[PDB]
């Protein structure tokens, strides 16, 4: 609850319980202004690409978070600690938080 | 100095011995003890079950540790196993100091 108060703390733990491992990770982000706030369409007719490389789409000013790689959660020691004594792993649940926003 | 756990009261010595069964004594009484026993021996099984107490590591090291691995290669014989005619051969001495605690 700002402005003179942090709206969240830095958590970057990685705890190893018996049959489950909780890998927190916190990063600092920076979001620019894309397209100068426009839904510009994108296609291949401007460049003139190949017959298999034609596309058509749209390009928003929105931006997404993609924590969809394994090293976004596992340090190389935690990955080594996992793959050496485990016949398997799967995720149960995630928990996403987004705090300390500064709009320059 | 050879390593290990110096114990004041160590595990006690378990001593075993075949009870001497004598052969036939003569008909007249003799004072001399016995110069003839029945040759015998024993066999059997023996179980030893030591419960150990482990100290789980509490490290915050980043990079991977050095750990005892087997040699991944096309080998002639598998280490710490039997041979073509059943001789268990330990190939190398394995210590116990592979992990890293800061001093």
Q: Which residue has the tokens 């931006």?
A: A63
Contact of B23 with B36, CB cutoff 8 Å:
yes
Query: How much helix, strand and coil, in percent to the nearest 5, is found in chain A?
Result: 10, 15, 75
- Does residue A80 belong to the interface with chain B, where contact is any CB pair within 8 Å? yes
CA torsion sign for A86, A90, A92, A94 is positive
B72: its two tokens = 């991944």
- Nearest Cα neighbor of B67 from A46, A4, B59 is B59
Method of determination is cryo-EM
Task: Specify the resolution in Å.
Answer: 3.3
Using alpha carbons only, how large is chain B's radius of gyration in Å? 26
Beta pairing partners, B47:
none
> A77 to chain B: which residues are within 8 Å by CB?
59, 61-65
Closest-CA distance of chain B to residue A82, Å:
11
Separation of alpha carbons A45 and B1, rounded Å: 82
Q: Cβ of A80 and B62 within 8 Å? A: no
Which helix (H) or strand (E) is A84 found in, with range? helix A76-84
Single out the residue of A71, A94, A92, A93 nearest to residue A83, CA to CA: A71
Alpha-carbon gap, residue B77 to B83, rounded angstroms: 7
Contact criterion met (CB < 8 Å) for B61 and A76: no
Give the list of residues 6+ apart from residue A31 with CB closer than 8 angstroms, or none.
A63
Burial (Cβ within 10 Å: 0-12, 13-18, ≥19) of residue B54? exposed
Half-sphere exposure at residue A59, Cβ-oriented, CA atoms within 13 angstroms = 10
Q: Are A20 and A92 in contact (CB under 8 A)?
A: yes
């Amino acid at each position: 609850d700002g402005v003179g108060n942090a709206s969240g703390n830095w958590h970057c733990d990685s705890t190893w319980l018996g049959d489950r491992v909780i890998t927190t990770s916190t990063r600092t982000w920076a979001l620019p202004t894309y397209n100068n706030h426009l839904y510009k369409q994108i296609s291949s007719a401007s460049t003139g690409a190949s017959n298999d490389n034609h596309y058509f789409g749209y390009s928003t000013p929105w931006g997404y978070f993609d924590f969809n790689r394994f090293h976004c959660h596992f340090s190389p020691r935690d990955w080594q600690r996992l793959i050496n004594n485990n016949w398997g792993f799967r995720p149960k649940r995630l928990n996403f938080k987004l705090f300390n926003i500064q709009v320059k | 100095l050879m390593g290990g756990f110096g114990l004041k009261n160590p595990p006690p010595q378990i001593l075993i011995k075949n009870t001497p069964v004598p052969a036939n004594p003569p008909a007249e009484f003799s004072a001399t003890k016995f110069a003839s026993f029945i040759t015998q021996y024993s066999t059997g099984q023996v179980s030893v079950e030591i419960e150990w107490e482990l100290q789980k590591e509490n490290s915050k090291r980043w990079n991977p540790e050095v750990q005892y691995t087997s040699n991944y290669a096309k080998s002639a014989n598998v280490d710490f196993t039997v041979d073509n005619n059943g001789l268990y051969t330990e190939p190398r001495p394995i210590g116990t100091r592979y992990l890293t605690r800061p001093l």
